[PDB]
Write a protein that binds this ligand. Structure first.
Ligand SMILES: [Mg+2]
Ligand SMILES: [Mg+2]
Ligand SMILES: [Mg+2]
Ligand SMILES: [Mg+2]
Ligand SMILES: [Mg+2]
Ligand SMILES: [Mg+2]
Ligand SMILES: [Mg+2]
Ligand SMILES: [Mg+2]
Ligand SMILES: [Mg+2]
Ligand SMILES: [Mg+2]
Ligand SMILES: [Mg+2]
Ligand SMILES: [Mg+2]
Ligand SMILES: [Mg+2]
Ligand SMILES: [Mg+2]
Ligand SMILES: [Mg+2]
Ligand SMILES: [Mg+2]
Ligand SMILES: [Mg+2]
Ligand SMILES: [Mg+2]
Ligand SMILES: [Mg+2]
Ligand SMILES: [Mg+2]
Ligand SMILES: [Mg+2]
Ligand SMILES: [Mg+2]
Ligand SMILES: [Mg+2]
Ligand SMILES: [Mg+2]
Ligand SMILES: [Mg+2]
Ligand SMILES: [Mg+2]
Ligand SMILES: [Mg+2]
Ligand SMILES: [Mg+2]
Ligand SMILES: [Mg+2]
Lengths: 169, 296, 159, 211
RNA sequence: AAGCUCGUAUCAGUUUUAUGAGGUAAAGCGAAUGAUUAGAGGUUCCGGGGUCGAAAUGACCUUGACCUAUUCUCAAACUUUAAAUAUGUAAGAAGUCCUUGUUACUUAAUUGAACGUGGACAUUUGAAUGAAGAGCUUUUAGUGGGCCAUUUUUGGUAAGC
RNA sequence: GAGAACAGAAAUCUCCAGUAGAACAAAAGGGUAAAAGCCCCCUUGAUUUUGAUUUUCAGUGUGAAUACAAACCAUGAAAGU
RNA sequence: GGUUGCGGCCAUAUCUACCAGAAAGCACCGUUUCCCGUCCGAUCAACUGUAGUUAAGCUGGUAAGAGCCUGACCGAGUAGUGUAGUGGGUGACCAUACGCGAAACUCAGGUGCUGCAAUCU
């Protein structure tokens, strides 16, 4: 049965992978600030590569997580840019989904040649109610199979509202 | 689950399971050991915790000692006993937590005999105090807060219960800095605020600020405050009389109870599946290998 | 060169008892010790503080003193041709109450019972312990049981 | 430069494996332990004959391999390279040292020299499976590998079907019933334990109690 | 060597009983780690090769790696299990139970902890065997190259090493 | 393992599985999972006094270690450490 | 008998897959004025018990289930071992005498017990 099990969106997490720190990265932070409204979070390189031109702990890529209605907007507003067509991939067998778009200008958000042009990673975490059981302190449990988000259940949820397309096979 | 996930014999065999109350996310043993253990030169002297727990909107207060067989409840007070004392709603909140502690404080200290000596503070101006040792007479009852897995944040209601047990006359060693009105940026306690929380004036001010700025929400939540004709201003005297009510007769009314234990056993055992016999289970296999196997 | 440090040779000796790792269960600290108790010493690798030296592993002694976290034990360790008195300061995790006297404490309050319950009856006691005696005579029946005659079997191989 | 095999014949030292603590050891002269038709099915080769050791001694890899040749060679050229499965049952895991050579006896711990298999009394060295009609070819096969070894070993007719664990009638009883299904070179057996579900999936020809 | 204080007393290169400790031997490897022979069945948008091809997140052979259920063989410096021999403690009068004193320690508390005053029960008084007794003190010699045998066992092909 | 623009075997983001297969300066062996590991917050108990104890042992010394006593402090709501 | 709070033992309590759960409880659940914490009221904090739900947790049952536990003249008196001989054998090794005695294996049975306080057709 299906009373309380519906489907909420847990969170949407945008992320910008840039191959360095400094000006180019603090700009990618400005992009996500005025887009999220919440201040974003920087990430440091995990090790050193030198073909990717990075030293460990270098400050590579900012990102942010957004929850609730505010995520529905940046979902749809970016979903538009994809013309509401994903692939049979893009959906994890564990139930979430994500895509990516170059040129943040292509959803809202004017240009500013002092801020440049950046591409993004949109990723969207789906969970039914009572997902707290996994995340709380006391009595931390796991969600039963007849609750856990599947790929099927999410694609069928996606092909419905938003009226988008799955494509591929 | 997922095919290439899950688990082998090897894995499951050599797996050492945690304790029960750790597999249940109920008990923090690292802190349990450090709360329970007694100085080995005090021998059988019990070390009594104050267990303060919060269900969804019921408050448990137990003064508890330990034994290798189990624990031992000296006295216990639940915040759902507050109706007896004049609190019918919002018995979860900070000032509900306070009173429940004061209930547990008066309750034990009574059945101990330290009732008339060691009354604690009747005033409740909210100044910082712990109950002092009465000269040439029994030292106070000593009890240590068992917070459980509750997170320690400044203002949290787990320390509300502390304040009521401490103001009730128990000796419960505590610092100030986790009470609301603890100034972060100076070590200073605004008491005019802490009184506001002991009497509920943070909830009363929600009522008032939701009187003229919206009534859609003020009726949704704060519903019952209408239906009994209680609007904010009286909230202070409600609790102020509950304190009087508690110190007057703490003695713990048990429920009248209606239907003997044997009764509850009967009806509830209807709804409980019972196990099987190997003979019954052997017949279930023999059935399967009849049908499923032999080509219909 | 040689290596003689304090915990040398103790690899399996301080090991944890398979699938028994982790915290020590809480009873270990609820147990209560008084001067005069006999305790057995088994060191617990998980508690590095207050650890007995490996020589006292598997050794029984008598507590001479009791402190916050610890009991002192005295052990007769024999060096050369004599015994010397060693006193050890042990965390309670390394010490369990000894059952070595329980058959004596059982037998004292038992020998007290059959003492009173006999004398008040007019004596006839016999409360000292006796060893296993040879068994008495008996008559084994052939009823339903006739001897089944066995012989040695020949050589086989079966591999 | 190979010291006469007389020198390592007996088991005088604790097992000295190639290890993190050894590391320098050479390679076994015998690298292949399964010869002839080893893809063959369990039903194909009922007759099993072992080479069995009567001593507690040590067999060099160089004597192992040299015997493996002599036995597999005789068998292929008479009964044919598909007529038998020769299984060397003994792996030379234990390293023989040597003190090569100026001081004489100071600091005499040797360096790896060769490898040997440590062999029990009654422990099987070679195992061969064929069909009963090939017996006398197999037996003379091992009998010549005998000459390649130190110390008495005796050839023995197995009471067992091939390399299986079952005596020939007990394998037949189980195989004409449902319980036995093919694998690899070996077989698998239907267990009366475990999930009933895929116990029936595998072994479909049981659950009749007939042919 | 000199003794000295005592003496059925206390004593033991022994057993029995009760209760501990141990990771050697064996054993184990379709249990962890590490080694090792053989196949069988699976999984690749993905290690490489080849036919089809404009290609494909293409299909088809293919050989590897992995996964699954099996299979042959091993460990001084591996191991779930786990001996035999060897080993700690206990088997009473320095014991057991009652009553209720002392304190500055400890308890919420005459609560406890420790040490006691007063009271109850004798040698079948608490297993075996032995006991030309047990306990104690002082002072001083020589020695401080060792070697052999059964069993365990290291280095060495070995050795009367 | 399954997912996300440039992004590839290796960059950052997310979910699932995860008895520890990691990490804890260093050799190895113990030990450790709401920790003993990782991130953060507050600090100086790495302090004062002088005894006992364990290993090595002659039951000397040294090294190292343990459990108390008497201070003065740290930290935590607290038990504690 | 159920449930809850605090437990003891710490897999007969774990794992995998499904089914069932009355009343109460627990829970999920609603809000962000306040104390408090976050990149994000997801966690954490406060407020509501109002506005919803048995879906999840939780409890139980099912499975020739994985694991785990217990037992047995199942294996096996086997392997190993203390003791003995002017025992056997060139040796490697082995047999016997008086004792002690496993592990795997095989088979059968089992799948948490339980302390304190409160609560409940
Ligand atoms: Mg198995
Ligand atoms: Mg664990
Ligand atoms: Mg804590
Ligand atoms: Mg050394
Ligand atoms: Mg020395
Ligand atoms: Mg230390
Ligand atoms: Mg060297
Ligand atoms: Mg020969
Ligand atoms: Mg050893
Ligand atoms: Mg070993
Ligand atoms: Mg061995
Ligand atoms: Mg074994
Ligand atoms: Mg292995
Ligand atoms: Mg491997
Ligand atoms: Mg390919
Ligand atoms: Mg003895
Ligand atoms: Mg005598
Ligand atoms: Mg005499
Ligand atoms: Mg001299
Ligand atoms: Mg001299
Ligand atoms: Mg000298
Ligand atoms: Mg020395
Ligand atoms: Mg040193
Ligand atoms: Mg209900
Ligand atoms: Mg359900
Ligand atoms: Mg729960
Ligand atoms: Mg089972
Ligand atoms: Mg002999
Ligand atoms: Mg023998």
């Amino acid at each position: 049965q299906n009373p309380m099990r519906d489907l909420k969106i847990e969170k949407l997490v945008l992320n910008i992978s840039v191959g360095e720190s400094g000006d180019r990265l603090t700009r990618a932070s400005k992009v996500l600030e005025q887009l999220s409204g919440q201040t974003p979070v920087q990430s440091k390189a995990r090790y050193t590569v030198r073909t990717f031109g990075i030293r460990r702990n270098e400050k590579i890529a900012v990102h942010v997580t957004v929850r609730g209605p505010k995520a529905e907007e940046i979902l749809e507003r970016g979903l538009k840019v994809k013309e509401y067509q994903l692939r049979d991939r893009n959906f994890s067998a564990t139930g979430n989904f994500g895509f990516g778009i170059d040129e943040h200008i292509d959803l809202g958000i004017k240009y500013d040649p002092s801020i440049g042009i950046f591409g993004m990673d949109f990723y969207v975490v789906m969970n039914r109610p009572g997902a707290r059981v996994t995340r709380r302190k006391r009595c931390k449990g796991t969600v039963g199979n007849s609750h856990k988000t599947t790929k099927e259940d999410t694609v069928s949820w996606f092909k419905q509202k938003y009226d988008a397309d799955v494509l591929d096979k | 689950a997922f095919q290439k996930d899950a688990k082998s014999s090897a894995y499951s065999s050599r797996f050492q399971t945690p304790f029960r109350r750790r597999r249940e996310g109920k008990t923090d043993y690292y802190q349990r050991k450090r709360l329970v253990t007694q100085h080995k030169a005090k021998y059988n002297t019990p070390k009594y915790r104050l267990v303060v727990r919060f269900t969804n909107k019921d408050i448990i207060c137990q003064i508890i000692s330990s034994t290798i067989t189990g624990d031992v409840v000296l006295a216990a007070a639940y915040s759902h006993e507050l109706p007896r004392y004049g609190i019918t709603h919002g018995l979860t909140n900070w000032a509900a937590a306070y009173a429940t502690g004061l209930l547990i404080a008066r309750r034990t200290l009574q059945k101990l005999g330290l009732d008339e000596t060691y009354k604690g503070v009747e005033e409740v101006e909210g100044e910082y105090e712990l109950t002092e040792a009465v000269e040439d007479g029994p030292r106070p009852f000593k009890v240590f807060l068992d917070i459980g897995l509750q997170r320690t944040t400044t203002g949290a209601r787990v320390f509300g219960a502390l304040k009521g047990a401490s103001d009730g006359g128990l000796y419960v060693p505590h610092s100030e800095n986790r009470f609301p009105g603890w100034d972060f940026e100076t070590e200073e306690i605004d008491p005019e605020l802490l009184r506001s929380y002991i009497f509920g004036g943070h909830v009363s001010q929600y009522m008032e600020e939701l009187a003229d700025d919206d009534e859609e929400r003020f009726s949704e939540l704060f519903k019952g405050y209408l239906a009994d004709d209680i609007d904010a201003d009286s909230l202070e005297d409600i609790y102020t009389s509950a304190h009087e009510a508690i110190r007057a007769d703490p003695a713990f009314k048990p429920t009248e109870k209606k239907f003997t234990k044997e009764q509850y056993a009967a009806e509830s055992k209807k709804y409980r599946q019972t196990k099987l016999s190997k003979e019954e289970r052997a017949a279930r296999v023999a059935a399967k290998i009849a049908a499923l196997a032999g080509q219909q | 060169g040689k290596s003689h440090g304090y915990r040398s040779r103790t690899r399996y000796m301080f090991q944890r008892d398979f699938r028994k790792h982790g915290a020590v269960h809480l009873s270990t600290y609820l147990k209560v010790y008084k001067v005069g108790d006999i305790v057995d010493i088994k060191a617990n690798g998980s508690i590095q503080k207050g650890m007995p030296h490996k020589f006292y592993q598997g050794k029984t002694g008598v507590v001479y003193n009791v402190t916050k976290s610890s009991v002192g034990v005295i052990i007769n360790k024999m060096v050369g041709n004599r015994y010397l008195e060693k006193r050890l300061n042990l965390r309670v995790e390394h010490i369990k109450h000894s059952k070595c006297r329980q058959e004596f404490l059982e037998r004292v309050k038992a020998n007290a019972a059959k003492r009173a319950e006999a004398k008040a009856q007019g004596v006839a006691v016999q409360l000292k312990r006796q060893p296993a005696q040879p068994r008495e005579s008996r008559i084994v029946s052939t009823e339903g049981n006739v001897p089944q005659t066995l012989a040695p079997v020949p050589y086989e191989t079966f591999i | 430069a190979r010291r006469p095999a007389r020198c390592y014949r007996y088991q005088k030292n604790k097992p000295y494996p190639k290890s993190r603590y050894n590391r320098a050891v050479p390679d076994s002269k015998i690298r292949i332990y399964d010869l002839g038709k080893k893809k063959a099915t369990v039903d194909e080769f009922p007759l099993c004959v072992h080479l069995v050791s009567n001593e507690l001694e040590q067999l060099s890899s160089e004597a192992l391999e040299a015997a493996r040749i002599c036995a597999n060679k005789y068998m292929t050229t008479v009964s044919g390279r598909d007529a038998f499965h020769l299984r060397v049952r003994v792996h030379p895991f234990h390293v023989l040292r040597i003190n090569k050579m100026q001081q004489g006896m100071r600091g005499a711990w040797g360096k790896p020299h060769g490898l040997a298999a440590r062999v029990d009394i009654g422990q099987i060295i070679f195992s061969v499976r064929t069909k009963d009609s090939n017996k006398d070819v197999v037996v003379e096969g091992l009998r010549r590998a005998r000459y390649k070894f130190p110390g008495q070993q005796k050839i023995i007719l197995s009471k067992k079907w091939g390399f299986t664990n079952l005596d020939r009638p007990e394998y037949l009883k189980k195989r004409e019933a449902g319980e036995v299904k093919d694998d690899g070179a070996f077989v698998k057996f239907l267990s009366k334990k475990g999930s009933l579900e895929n116990n029936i999936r595998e072994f479909p020809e049981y659950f009749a109690a007939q042919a």
